[PDB]
Amino acid sequence: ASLPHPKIVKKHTKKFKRHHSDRYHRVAENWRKQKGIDSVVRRRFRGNISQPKIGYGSNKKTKFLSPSGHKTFLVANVKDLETLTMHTKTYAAEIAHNISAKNRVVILARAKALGIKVTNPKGRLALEA
Amino acid sequence: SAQKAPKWYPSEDVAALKKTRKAARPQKLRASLVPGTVLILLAGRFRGKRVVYLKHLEDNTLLISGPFKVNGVPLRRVNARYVIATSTKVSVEGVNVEKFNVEYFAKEKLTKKEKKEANLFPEQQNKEIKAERVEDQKVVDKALIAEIKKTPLLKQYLSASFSLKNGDKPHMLKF
Amino acid sequence: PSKNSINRPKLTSNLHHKVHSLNKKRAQRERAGLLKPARSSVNSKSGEIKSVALDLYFQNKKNSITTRTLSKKRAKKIERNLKYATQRKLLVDASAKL
Amino acid sequence: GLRSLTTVWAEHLSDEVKRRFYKNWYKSKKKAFTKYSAKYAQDGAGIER
Amino acid sequence: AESHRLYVKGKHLSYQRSKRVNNPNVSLIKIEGVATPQDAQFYLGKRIAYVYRASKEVRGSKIRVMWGKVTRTHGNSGVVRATFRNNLPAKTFGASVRIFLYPSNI
Amino acid sequence: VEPVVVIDGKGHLVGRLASVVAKQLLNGQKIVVVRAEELNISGEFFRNKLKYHDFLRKATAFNKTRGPFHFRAPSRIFYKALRGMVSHKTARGKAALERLKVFEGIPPPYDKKKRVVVPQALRVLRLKPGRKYTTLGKLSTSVGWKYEDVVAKLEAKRKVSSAEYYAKKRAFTKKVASANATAAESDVAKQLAALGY
RNA sequence: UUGGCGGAAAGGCCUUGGGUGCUUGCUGGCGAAUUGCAAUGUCAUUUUGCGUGGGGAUAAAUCAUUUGUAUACGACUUAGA
RNA sequence: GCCCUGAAAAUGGAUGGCGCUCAAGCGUGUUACCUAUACUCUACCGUCAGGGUUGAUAUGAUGCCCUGACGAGUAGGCAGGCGUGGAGGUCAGUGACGAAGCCUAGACCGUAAGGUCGGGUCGAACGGCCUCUAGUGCAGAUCUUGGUGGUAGUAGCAAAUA
RNA sequence: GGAAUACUGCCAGCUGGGACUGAGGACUGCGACGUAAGUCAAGGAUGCUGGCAUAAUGGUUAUAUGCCGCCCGUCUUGAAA
RNA sequence: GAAAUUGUUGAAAGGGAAGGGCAUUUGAUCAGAC
Ligand SMILES: [Mg+2]
Ligand SMILES: [Mg+2]
Ligand SMILES: [Mg+2]
Ligand SMILES: [Mg+2]
Ligand SMILES: [Mg+2]
Ligand SMILES: [Mg+2]
Ligand SMILES: [Mg+2]
Ligand SMILES: [Mg+2]
Ligand SMILES: [Mg+2]
Ligand SMILES: [Mg+2]
Ligand SMILES: [Mg+2]
Ligand SMILES: [Mg+2]
Ligand SMILES: [Mg+2]
Ligand SMILES: [Mg+2]
Ligand SMILES: [Mg+2]
Ligand SMILES: [Mg+2]
Ligand SMILES: [Mg+2]
Ligand SMILES: [Mg+2]
Ligand SMILES: [Mg+2]
Ligand SMILES: [Mg+2]
Ligand SMILES: [Mg+2]
Ligand SMILES: [Mg+2]
Ligand SMILES: [Mg+2]
Ligand SMILES: [Mg+2]
Ligand SMILES: [Mg+2]
Ligand SMILES: [Mg+2]
Ligand SMILES: [Mg+2]
Ligand SMILES: [Mg+2]
Ligand SMILES: [Mg+2]
Ligand SMILES: [Mg+2]
């Protein structure tokens, strides 16, 4: 498969959503810090939402790794894929979103002939059977 | 180029472990488990059966026998934490148990190499038991039944099943 | 509960009938077939592309109120791309047979 | 409190009380107390019970 | 015979709590027949099953099990503390659980 | 241990009984309380009647139909103490209160069943001798309950029937004991005695 | 199956006389395995549905028309196959 | 010492509530038990400090590694990063076998700002990295302009004889 | 007169039960046991076994339950006002 | 051809507001992989 690697631990899996993004449509869900002088979220009263902190950060040995155990590298063509030729156990390739189907079949055939895992095969390649 | 390459790559050279310092020493069983003891089975398909303890194996299991004629439990292995040892004892010093080991109960576990009856390919054919197994059962039954004919009601005791009644507190209970 | 009649169970009867009716609804939906099959089933799309347009195209190629239609523009694009893929597979098996 | 437990009626009621039991008397088949009138047949014994 | 039981009955009382904060990771179990912590020390490290039924059959059965273990005693009156693999659903405060006789020592 | 526990409320103290019944209900046991007109409260009759009048005085001033409702039956006085001792606004407390039934007298089908007592709520075990106590039927009759004579007549009828039943069962127990004592001084009786039975 | 009894919410309790099964009260003969060293390892209780299965039972209410002992409108109270 | 009196004001109410009388009250004593983001031990993140490491074939000497301690915060200071419109260079980058945009009870990465993939819609342009530049990031200002609600099928459509 | 037992304290005395954790990754150090090669519980977990191989574990999502949770921005010594 | 706002269909919840946090049950849905 991939390289042997330890168990991956996530200290927080729920998203950090901005306060009152459920009352108003004008308030988006992207995180913004509460800066008001009377804010219960800023003053950290019991029963309110949590805020991002540096203590939540993940282990350096398993950071950026997918559940398979690879790191994702974005690939646009065959030279980009041939960059990853001697690192098939740490990196997995991924075809970019704007590559067409005619070039995706060429990228996938080269990836199979060389041994690189592709995280998104079958994308844009229905009707090929 | 959708991405620029890393300046560094971690090595795909797999490392070896350090020298570990954990040696295997044999089990230290309970002081209520000596061969000849009547045990109560707590889990399994033979729940609540009274069984006779014969031999301690090398994989930390116990060799047990019903006998097969008094309650229908064959020569089996069992785990020592899944059993209750009682204070009744029979004489096991007339039985030869020097042939049973792990390779005796070794099973052809070839189903993990693509079992065509994973669920079932036939759901039938009613698997057959070997004559060597049946003969070992017969000789140990003879040597044990000759000894457990000597105390009264012991055969009836080994035939009957164990169960908890109303108001039976197991922490206050002798066995 | 319900001070007009304190010796009668109210909430537990409501919860009992409620979960019975919910499980009846689930069995009716499963027998009508409005649920996805098993993952190991022979008509499971798990792992592949989910596409309303491709499903409608292949269903009408094989051949009561709904809100999923097909759009002739997209249908012409599907027919063109299928001809491209057929030319590719014909090139492949022509090279293989030669 | 008080609880009613048994009601007994007579064998021959009239059209005025039957009109009381109906809301649309001009359309009805006037079927009221027709099975109850059979309780007085020879023994019957439900009346006496 | 007429009885086939090989477990002890208990009741799920509540979570661990102070007065206005609870802790769903630890449950409190009342074992039937235990009055003291010296008698509850027999049941430490025994396995518990919460057995319940569902209407959708999953893998040959409509009966589902949650597994846990006894960890320590709680208080002066024979209640014990327990942890489960997944925490108990909290609508079962007052429901009954099964304490098995294994892993055995006597 | 029983599926339903039936408690004879004669001679118990009201709050000490309500505390243990509330804990049993929250732990998940079904309780039926009979003879709720025979309960006791510690203190004089006049003092307890004045406490009930202080309760009777409280009502919603702009609409008396919205206010606290003052129920006059002894079973309802007991229920008011129990509802105070549970948290009845939640679904857990509602289910716990739906595990309970309270009656005056012993109606069917509970007049053929076994009734128990609670020793830590009993008046002869808890009150100091010489103290005064109140009876709940008299208190409820003085504050407005109107069925004290009907219940007394029905309870007299039930007592006559259960006295006949007990005479029959006592004669049967006598002949069974005489038949059992003549099979003692047997060999299996001596073996049972050595094993302790 | 023969009788009684039970109205507080009886909805249950007692009994007669024959059929027929079991009996561990005592003594014998076979059987059980492989669920593989545990996995609740599924055992009591219910209301129907598709019409097939057996006798039996053939109704009313509302709108519309009308009255005024009623009425803001609904409602109420009358009449008419 | 304890108890009763030792003056109380107007909606129905408060040892928190139920309730409690050899207490579930008051005085005193001895044990057991319950639980804080506090204490102890372990892991992980970050910051600070003290140190080790020349061999190029293998990487980032701004790297890799070892050890110890610490972490609240308004006004305010400083640092490291995320995103947008244009400019120079590069990837002989992506694109009618479908660019940008928009929708998405699908998937992944990051503490986060955000980034990436799938599907639908669409029909002609647009990105990554190294740098340059600014009319560069909104929930508020009885903000500006445009659009749309509840109120609500409601108030009402009754002067001047028909 | 001769003891014992309480109470307080010590042991580099033995021994049973339960829970949580397993960081690190060739060797290097300090020791222990043995006359010595060796062995070891001595600078951080290994050994043996079973089931399942998919929606089973797990994620997302809609709810239910237990406990907790006042409306944001702003001036003020003082904001749910 | 975005949002506010609205219609139809499907699923759900509802004894005097709704929304939120921690934890799990139930239903629906889903990726990885051996
Ligand atoms: Mg995340
Ligand atoms: Mg302030
Ligand atoms: Mg108190
Ligand atoms: Mg005191
Ligand atoms: Mg303690
Ligand atoms: Mg600190
Ligand atoms: Mg800080
Ligand atoms: Mg600041
Ligand atoms: Mg500009
Ligand atoms: Mg730009
Ligand atoms: Mg091109
Ligand atoms: Mg596009
Ligand atoms: Mg959405
Ligand atoms: Mg970007
Ligand atoms: Mg460029
Ligand atoms: Mg500007
Ligand atoms: Mg803007
Ligand atoms: Mg705005
Ligand atoms: Mg602002
Ligand atoms: Mg405007
Ligand atoms: Mg109008
Ligand atoms: Mg006007
Ligand atoms: Mg006019
Ligand atoms: Mg390790
Ligand atoms: Mg799931
Ligand atoms: Mg789950
Ligand atoms: Mg779920
Ligand atoms: Mg609160
Ligand atoms: Mg404020
Ligand atoms: Mg919209």
Short mmCIF file of N, CA, C and O (backbone and C1' of nucleotides) and ligand atoms in Angstrom, two decimals, chain A residues 37-38 42-43, chain I residues 76 78-79, ligand 2:
data_model
loop_
_atom_site.label_atom_id
_atom_site.label_comp_id
_atom_site.label_asym_id
_atom_site.label_seq_id
_atom_site.Cartn_x
_atom_site.Cartn_y
_atom_site.Cartn_z
N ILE A 37 -17.62 43.99 22.97
CA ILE A 37 -17.26 44.26 24.35
C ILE A 37 -18.09 43.46 25.34
O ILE A 37 -17.69 43.30 26.49
N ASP A 38 -19.25 42.94 24.92
CA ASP A 38 -20.16 42.23 25.79
C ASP A 38 -20.38 40.79 25.36
O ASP A 38 -21.33 40.16 25.82
N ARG A 42 -16.84 35.63 23.17
CA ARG A 42 -15.50 36.11 23.45
C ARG A 42 -15.14 35.92 24.92
O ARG A 42 -14.01 35.52 25.24
N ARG A 43 -16.08 36.17 25.83
CA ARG A 43 -15.78 35.98 27.24
C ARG A 43 -15.85 34.53 27.69
O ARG A 43 -15.58 34.28 28.87
P U I 76 -16.59 55.26 27.28
"O5'" U I 76 -17.55 54.99 28.51
"C5'" U I 76 -18.07 56.06 29.29
"C4'" U I 76 -19.10 55.58 30.28
"C3'" U I 76 -18.55 54.82 31.47
"O3'" U I 76 -18.07 55.68 32.49
"C1'" U I 76 -20.38 53.64 30.56
P G I 78 -17.62 49.96 33.14
"O5'" G I 78 -19.02 49.41 33.64
"C5'" G I 78 -19.12 48.21 34.37
"C4'" G I 78 -20.45 48.07 35.05
"C3'" G I 78 -21.67 48.03 34.15
"O3'" G I 78 -21.90 46.75 33.57
"C1'" G I 78 -22.06 49.52 35.93
P A I 79 -21.73 46.52 31.99
"O5'" A I 79 -23.20 46.19 31.47
"C5'" A I 79 -23.81 44.94 31.76
"C4'" A I 79 -25.09 44.72 30.99
"C3'" A I 79 -24.94 44.31 29.53
"O3'" A I 79 -25.96 43.38 29.19
"C1'" A I 79 -26.27 46.24 29.66
MG MG K 2 -17.37 45.33 29.85
#
